[PDB]
Amino acid sequence: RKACRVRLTNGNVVSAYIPGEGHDAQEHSIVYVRGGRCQDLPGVKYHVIRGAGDLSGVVNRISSRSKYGAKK
Amino acid sequence: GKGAAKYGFKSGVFPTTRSILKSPTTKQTDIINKVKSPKPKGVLGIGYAKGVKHPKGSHRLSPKVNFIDVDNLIAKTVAEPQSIKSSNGSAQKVRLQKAELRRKFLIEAFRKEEARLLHKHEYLQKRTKELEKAKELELEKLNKEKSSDLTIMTLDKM
Amino acid sequence: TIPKPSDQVPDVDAFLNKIGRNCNELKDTFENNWNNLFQWDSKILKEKGVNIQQRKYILKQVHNYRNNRPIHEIKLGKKSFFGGERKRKAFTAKWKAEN
Amino acid sequence: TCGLVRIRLARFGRKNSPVYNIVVANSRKARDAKPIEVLGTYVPVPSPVTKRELKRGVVPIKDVKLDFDRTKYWIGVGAQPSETVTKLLRKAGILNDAWATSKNRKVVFERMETL
Amino acid sequence: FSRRRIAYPFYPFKKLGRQHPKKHDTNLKTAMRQFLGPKNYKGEYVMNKYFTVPTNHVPNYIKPDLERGQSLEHPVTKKPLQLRYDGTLGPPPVENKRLQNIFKDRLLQPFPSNPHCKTNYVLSPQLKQSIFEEITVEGLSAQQVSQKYGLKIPRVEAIVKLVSVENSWNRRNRVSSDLKTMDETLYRMFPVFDSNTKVIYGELVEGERSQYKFTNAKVGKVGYRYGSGNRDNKKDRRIGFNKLGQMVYI
Amino acid sequence: PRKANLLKSLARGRVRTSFNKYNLFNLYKKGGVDLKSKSLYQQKWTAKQETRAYHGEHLTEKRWQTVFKPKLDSVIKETPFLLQTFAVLEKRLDFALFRAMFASSVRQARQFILHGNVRVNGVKIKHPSYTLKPGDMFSVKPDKVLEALGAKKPSFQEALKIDKTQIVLWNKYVKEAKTEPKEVWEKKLENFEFDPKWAKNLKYHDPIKLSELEGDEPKARKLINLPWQKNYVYGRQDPKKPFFTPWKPRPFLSPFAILPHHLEISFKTCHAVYLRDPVARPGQSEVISPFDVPVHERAYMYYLRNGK
RNA sequence: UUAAGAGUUAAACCUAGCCAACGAUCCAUAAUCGAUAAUGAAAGUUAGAACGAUCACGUUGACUCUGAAAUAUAGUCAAUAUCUAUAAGAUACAGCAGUGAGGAAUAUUGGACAAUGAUCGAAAGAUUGAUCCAGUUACUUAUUAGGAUGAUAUAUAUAUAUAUAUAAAUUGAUUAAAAAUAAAAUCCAUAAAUAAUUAAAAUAAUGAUAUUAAUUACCAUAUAUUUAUAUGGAUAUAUAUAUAUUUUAAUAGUCCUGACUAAUAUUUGUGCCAGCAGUCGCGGUAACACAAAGAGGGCGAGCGUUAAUCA
Ligand SMILES: [Mg+2]
Ligand SMILES: [Mg+2]
Ligand SMILES: [Mg+2]
Ligand SMILES: [Mg+2]
Ligand SMILES: [Mg+2]
Ligand SMILES: [Mg+2]
Ligand SMILES: [Mg+2]
Ligand SMILES: [Mg+2]
Ligand SMILES: [Mg+2]
Ligand SMILES: [Mg+2]
Ligand SMILES: [Mg+2]
Ligand SMILES: [Mg+2]
Ligand SMILES: [Mg+2]
Ligand SMILES: [Mg+2]
Ligand SMILES: [Mg+2]
Ligand SMILES: [Mg+2]
Ligand SMILES: [Mg+2]
């Protein structure tokens, strides 16, 4: 499972699960973090938003497009 | 929305309605009687007892209630043109007519407010006096209840 | 009804020049016709290209002429020379420094 | 309008559909703040009338609800009505022609009081 | 256990068999066709019992349970007709006794599933005229007429108003032949019923476009209250209709 | 409001407030609502589906929830109290039109209202949501009522072909009558339960040509002389009226012809009076519905809690 | 001292008290409230945006004048930070627009004083970023956002169950497997547009909004009580007058279908990987749970998700 370490704008540091088939997030990328924990992974309490910042929508996504930042 | 249910389900407040006469009028005898009645001292008392001392810099009894005399207010506030000294004036006649209307309106207001207070008090007193009839007829109905009694002690009486 | 020209006010152009307020630019729009000046309302003035402040002012002065009250110009209020009350102190400080 | 106590109209309703509240208020206080008293309501818009009713002879009616006895009390004390309130009260007969102004002939319908 | 259940007919019907691949048909369409019957060149479905309205003051409502799903009948003889293995509509094997055994109320029941629903009776035009004459002319109050004819007061008042409108239309002959035909048709489809404050109006001088009307009211009861709840951005937004019929926010 | 889609699908089999043939079949084949072998939530959902398909399909769900009145009104048999779940809708103007038989659907009544054909107490109301008070009188333009309760006006081409076929069959009948007249008369009497001039009186008719009659309706009007339709194309006596002009009741009208209790109707003038709000009484409910009390009570329990 | 009580402030002299485990003192946090909003069956709980009431502040602190009322958005002094005019200077946008920063995120450097108010003036009238209007933004709510009919296409010859042929017939499937009356087609409307006219907000007159709402589909009058037949100005035509009298539509997403939990018509790809997931949990060649096609179930100009409140 793909997760990232994210320093937020309030100053805290969190662990965020990157959903979707493919992540375009590298180090020093700008992301937006929402609540929600990766249930089967302890310590990742947050979800990175797909379609915001430097995270793009899931490529070739056609169902539940909104949740994954896809366009159509 | 819940609190409005206390007031007839009315949302929003009007300003509190003002009183034309701020103090009771002289003709309103009942308030004078309560005011000049003997002051009770005891378990439920309102004033310092006979031998009790009040603080050196305080007044023993509360300020006297100043009872309005409607005629006095009408004479001092509204008054009347003492003399008819005047001439034709574009502003003089206008101001005289304005002042006459205001005089009439305030006189009518004061008199009507006194009248409503008097009539209302008489109304409440009357209602109580008719309720006295209900009490006395109930007592009479108790007579006929015990008119048919054979003087033996009875459980309800025990 | 229409009120007749006075000897003070022979024609429409006299009225426009007298009332002032830069209204004398509207001579052409009225075509010097007294009757048309005293017959149409602000909808026609709006169509004819008169802007808001003017058509309101000319209707005011037309009413004044109808009821015989004078139609002399009253200049719109201007701010003080030193400036508005809020900026007056700073402007006076600067102006006194320059003189 | 002058003095501390003034009888005015406070704007209630929504955008593009005014109604007004005949109030007795401090001059120095805001227009829409709670006043000393609320003497009435005034709906400016005339009641629409059918084209037939224009021929029959009725006219649009504007609805004013007012406390006549209390407004007399406030006028007597020296509360100063505003121009619009002056116009309304003068039509009501509460105020006579002494309150008329130079800026302001025949009577088709004279004022009538009914129950 | 809930299942997405395709609404197949409860009664038995002749289902599809081996089909030409290009038919592209569904059982529901076959049920539709069997319920209707053959389609006429005019577009009608004469074979059905429900294509044509009744004309003897006895409403004809669907009775699928009492019919066992067979809804075809001879348009003239009115005897039942049912599908056959030959493929041509023909007489039934046996009489359906339940079509004969119809309860008196069930004849007036629109929908089989809802027994409480029933169709109101149509008043005879003579009765409407009698009510109109009794109230308008003789002066008998709506109470007396309602007691007389076993009707309700509001229905009586509605009858009077409708007969007034009918009188005006008849006076102008605004009724047309199509309207009369529809009236006579609908009439025969239903069973026939068997017997103070101070107000000041201000002065209106010439040129005034409207008249102020002043109504007496008491302080603490007159006004728009301050701090009233704003419901415009809420689901309970209050809406009314001006007397012109324009929707206004009340 | 809701965009109408798949309202009359046979697979779904939901009955709608309509006089349509497909709606008639959907009502026919349903039988009764199946609430058995279902949890309480599933019973409530099925009741919602069935009842909400009929009573207010156009109403939005979040709007119906606000309109829904949790407190009902009721004035030996049993009172069906919970059939009044949807009685609140019965005072809406469009529902009043549909119940008065002034429209073939609630959506058609809505279009009638929005297109200015409806009046309530003599003022033109253009809003379907207008609520009727008791005693109100509302009227619809008679042309639209006749269109609602009448068959579709055929196109010129369709009626022309229908006339072609009618001429063909009339010629066939007169031919067979001429060949075998006596027994033709006798066997016609056989259904109805000799004069040789009978077949002589009957007269042929000339087959028309679509190509030559196309686009000339006044000519086609003169060219037809059938005994039953003399000088007018089928269904187009006056081609400038919105309905089948030799006025004919629409097909499949008897199933849905319910006379409501709460309304008093005048078909001659296309007027109606709203007597009262529908009220349940012992053994009878004035809310015309195709569903039984259990379905309505399940829907009522659904809407009381809003699906909880 | 004050108009006025009081260790409120200043002076003097006495007594030893006062508060506190039903929580003092201290610390942290917070503007408070309603006939306001949310929620609940209710008690209550939450918010204090919007409507209204009270208080405090107008870059920070202290003091002074005036005054009835001020530690005033005043004055003096100082602090912070900028500008020039370099002076016992000015300014501090928590007034309306607007800019930069911070933020997940919250608009016009708009029009008019026409209305309702405020100030000045005797008056005419002047000013009004209050206010009224409009602009942007689905942030919220409401109304509209099209009804009826509709499973075939050709050929044959006062009645009426018209019948025969041929031809085709998209996706899935071989029957209770459907998509689907859904399309197309037909009938009839209306919105918009185009013409006229046209209120009301305001009257003595004044209309920003405004290319006004609304009404009629040529225009009036003349009678009846909305529908009509008439008289008179339009109207192109053909040849003053028989005729008709603008045109006209259609525009839906987003989530989900193992149970909770509504969603049976089935197939494909992957194979404890990719991935999903609110809880149970799913994924090893047969996945109803991942990624999809078909079908289906919600809500719908919104749908889902996150964050919070109540239950
Ligand atoms: Mg000057
Ligand atoms: Mg399920
Ligand atoms: Mg704070
Ligand atoms: Mg708090
Ligand atoms: Mg604070
Ligand atoms: Mg607030
Ligand atoms: Mg704010
Ligand atoms: Mg301060
Ligand atoms: Mg600042
Ligand atoms: Mg300060
Ligand atoms: Mg600002
Ligand atoms: Mg102004
Ligand atoms: Mg401005
Ligand atoms: Mg295939
Ligand atoms: Mg998913
Ligand atoms: Mg799932
Ligand atoms: Mg909405």
Residue numbers in the entry:
A (entry chain L): 78 to 149
B (entry chain V): 2 to 159
C (entry chain 2): 30 to 128
D (entry chain P): 2 to 105, 110 to 120
E (entry chain 6): 27 to 221, 291 to 345
F (entry chain D): 2 to 76, 88 to 205, 372 to 486
From the paper:
Furthermore, this series of intermediates from two species with divergent mitoribosomal architecture uncovers both conserved principles and species-specific adaptations that govern the maturation of mitoribosomal small subunits in eukaryotes.
Consistent with this idea, this backpack module and h45 are flexible and unresolved in state 1, whereas in state 2, these elements have been docked onto the particle. In states 1 and 2, the pentatricopeptide repeat protein Ccm1 localizes to the 5′ precursor of the 15S rRNA in a position that is subsequently occupied by mS47 both in state 3 and in the mature yeast mtSSU. Ccm1 uses structure and sequence-specific RNA recognition, binding to a single-stranded region of the precursor and specifically recognizing bases −6 to −1. Ccm1 is therefore in the unique position to chaperone mitochondrial pre-rRNA in a co-transcriptional manner similarly to eukaryotic ribosome assembly factors binding to other 5′ precursor elements.
